[PDB]
């Protein structure tokens, strides 16, 4: 009772039922470095301008 | 200070938009009005300086220098207009523009609060001054004189730029009001020895310090008359003014770092005074006289006492008017005989009686006759250096003897004796020349009636 699979069948992506638990850390990767402190706030004008030497603005 | 900066700038469109033949009339008249308004800076308090804004301030030190600066522009215009008569109009206007731009830089230099702003404007004065000497000087050597003037100054100023920027990083500011309160003592180390030198040597070359002075006689012999007047009256005082301010932040290291420069100045003043006795060129003699006088200023600034700072301020003002007058007197002879040799034309009192009186009055102030402000300043410096060390009275005393000798020798050689037989183009003094001389000496002698306004902040 064997039927030959048709053109295209054997290249299908199929789904599989497995009791094997889904791997948690397959790459065995360490903990990632913490991101730099994100900056959030209201952008105010620069205090007293450029402050470059003698400039007032 | 904008009430002086803007009208000074307006002298430029005034000159360029004037009728062709009214460039000298217009610029002279309006630069005198500016000079008149400069007396409003006399609103000086006993505790606080006059602090206009974040950028500019006046105190008792800068105010007399500012008034001298603004008074000198109209005088330089009268002095210059004769020898520039054959110049084409556009080049006359450019000459006046260089003088106006020099005044603009000078009044900003003397009033800047922040020391880098002082440095930039202090440096900006080089450009017009160099242009005036090299473009409108008379002889071949003016190109070399420009190079010596430029590179002497830059050899000193560039280390100053590094030191000032260093100071701001460490202290956080170069505002002079802040430095008065945040100043910290300079501790002994090789780093601070070179910081001290970088802070001072630029101003020493300007004074000029003895040993660094040889550029000055070259510049004067080569410069046109207006160049000499601004050079002698105000430009040398940038060094004095700079040292008076920057010594605030160099204590106590100045206590021993000053010694080599006091020895140079104390000995230098005797050597330059004696040199004046043997000079053959009249402009070169006056240039050496300036080195001798400025030697006292350096000593007074370095010993840092109230009396010496008052003496230094008074001498700077008195020397400015006197030396500028002497150059104008020498120039008026030059415009007749076209030679700076002192022995060429003699016995000129017989031919120009009134002009011989200007010579006499100028010489009397140069040798510091009491009660001229020339003596007041010199006397105050002599009093303070006596306390510094009693022995200095001998060096000061000898210099006063030699100073009288070359001051009168210059008067005797040119004005007395027998007139040179073959010189027969000694025309009578012009009203312009007499007015020019009297606009030096009259303000100078009027200041005797009220000296306090030239004694600086320590008064
Ligand atoms: C527009 C209008 O109607 O109102 C504008 C304005 C009114 O504004 P405001 O809020 O009422 O305050 C104005 C105060 O005067 C000023 O208020 P402020 O608190 O903003 O102060 C001015 C401030 C504002 O920020 C600025 O920097 C602006 C710069 C102004 C022009 C300065 C360049 C000319 C330098 C002097 C010469 O300047 C600074 O902080 C930096 C100091 C600048 C010092 C000048 C030298 C700096 C460079 C050194 C190399 C140059 C040496 C001298 C040459 O009126 C003006 O004053 C006009 C601005 C001036 C520039 C335009 C005219 C050109 C001048 C040409 C000079 C020719 C030089 C000859 C050589």
Q: How far apart are CA B198 and CA B192, in angstroms?
A: 10
Classify burial at B369, counting beta carbons within 10 Å of its beta carbon; exposed 0-12, middle 13-18, buried 19 or more: middle
Count CA atoms within 13 Å of residue B439 on its CB side: 19
Q: What whole-number distance in Å separates Cα of residue B397 and Cα of residue B403?
A: 10
**What gap in Å lies between CA A1 and CA A25, rounded to an integer?**
43
Tokens in use for B200? Answer: 């001072």
Collect all residues of chain B within an 8 Å Cβ-Cβ radius of residue A57.
none
Residue B114 · residue B55 · CB < 8 Å:
yes
CA B21 to centroid of ligand 1, rounded, Å: 33
Reported resolution in A? 2.3
Q: Which candidate, B214, B196, B384, B373, places its Cα nearest to that of B299?
A: B384
Give Cα B178 distance to the centre of its chain. 28
**Backbone region of residue B53 per phi and psi (left: phi > 0; alpha: psi in -120 to 50; beta: other values):** beta
CA distance linking residue B81 with residue B70, whole number of Å: 18
Helix intervals (H) in B207-305: 215-222, 225-230, 236-246, 254-257, 259-276, 282-303
Least CA distance to A55: which residue of chain B? B55
The span from the CA of B308 to the CA of B458, in Å, is 9
- Give dist(CA B261, CA B249) in Å, integer: 18
Distance of alpha carbon B92 from alpha carbon B15, whole angstroms: 10
Of B208, B344, B206, nearest to B272 (Cα)? B208
Q: Which residues of A touch B114 (CB under 8 A)?
A: 53-54
d(CA A42, nearest CA chain B) in Å? 27
> Tokens for B63?
């105010």
Task: Name the token pair of B176.
Answer: 């002079």
Q: How far apart are CA B338 and CA B139, in angstroms?
A: 12
CA distance linking residue B340 with residue B333, whole number of Å: 8
């Amino acid at each position: 009772g064997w039927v030959r699979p048709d053109l295209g069948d054997l290249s299908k992506v199929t789904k599989v039922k497995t009791d094997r638990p889904l791997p948690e850390n397959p790459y065995h990767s360490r903990a990632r470095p913490e991101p730099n402190p994100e900056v959030e706030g209201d952008l105010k004008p620069a205090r007293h301008g450029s402050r470059l030497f003698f400039w007032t603005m | 200070m904008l009430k002086y900066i803007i009208p000074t700038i307006m002298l430029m469109p005034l000159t360029w938009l004037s009728k062709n033949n009214m460039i000298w009339v217009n610029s002279t008249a309006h630069s005198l009005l500016i000079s008149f308004t400069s007396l409003l800076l006399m609103n000086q308090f006993g505790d606080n300086s006059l602090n206009f804004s974040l950028l500019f301030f006046s105190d008792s030190l800068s105010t007399p220098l500012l008034i001298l600066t603004m008074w000198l522009l109209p005088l330089m215009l009268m002095a210059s207009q004769h020898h520039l008569s054959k110049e084409n109009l556009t080049r006359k206007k450019l000459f006046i523009t260089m003088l106006i731009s020099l005044q603009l830089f000078l009044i900003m230099t003397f009033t800047a609060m922040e020391l880098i702003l002082f440095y930039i404007l202090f440096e900006a004065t080089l450009v017009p001054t160099l242009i005036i000497i090299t473009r409108w000087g008379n002889q071949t050597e003016r190109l070399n004189a420009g190079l010596y003037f430029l590179f002497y100054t830059l050899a000193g100023s560039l280390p100053l730029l590094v030191a000032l920027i260093y100071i701001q990083n460490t202290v956080g500011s170069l505002n002079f009001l802040m430095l008065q309160y945040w100043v910290q003592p300079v501790h002994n180390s090789w780093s601070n020895v070179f910081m001290w030198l970088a802070c001072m040597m630029a101003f020493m070359v300007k004074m000029p310090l003895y040993g660094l002075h040889l550029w000055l006689p070259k510049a004067h012999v080569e410069a046109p008359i207006a160049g000499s007047m601004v050079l002698a009256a105000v430009l040398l005082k940038l060094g004095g003014y700079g040292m008076l301010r920057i010594t605030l932040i160099l204590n106590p290291m100045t206590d021993f770092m000053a010694y080599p420069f006091i020895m140079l100045s104390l000995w230098g003043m005797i050597m330059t005074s004696s040199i004046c006795l043997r000079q053959t060129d009249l402009k070169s003699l006056i240039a050496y006289s300036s080195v001798s006088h400025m030697a006292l200023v350096i000593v007074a600034i370095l010993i840092q006492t109230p009396w010496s700072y008052m003496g230094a301020t008074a001498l700077m003002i008195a020397h400015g008017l006197t030396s500028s007058m002497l150059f104008c007197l020498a120039n008026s002879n030059y415009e007749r005989i076209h030679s700076r040799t002192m022995i060429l034309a003699r016995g000129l009192q017989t031919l120009l009686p009134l002009m011989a009186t200007w010579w006499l009055l100028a010489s009397l102030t140069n040798l510091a006759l009491p009660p001229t402000i020339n003596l007041i300043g010199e006397l105050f410096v002599v009093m303070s250096t006596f306390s510094w060390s009693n022995i200095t009275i001998i060096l000061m005393g000898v210099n006063m003897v030699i100073t009288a000798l070359y001051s009168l020798y210059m008067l005797i050689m040119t004005q007395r004796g027998k007139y040179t037989y073959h010189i027969n183009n000694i025309s009578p003094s012009f009203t312009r020349e007499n007015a020019l001389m009297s606009l030096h000496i009259l303000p100078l002698l009027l200041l005797t009636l009220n000296p306090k306004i030239i004694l600086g902040p320590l008064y």
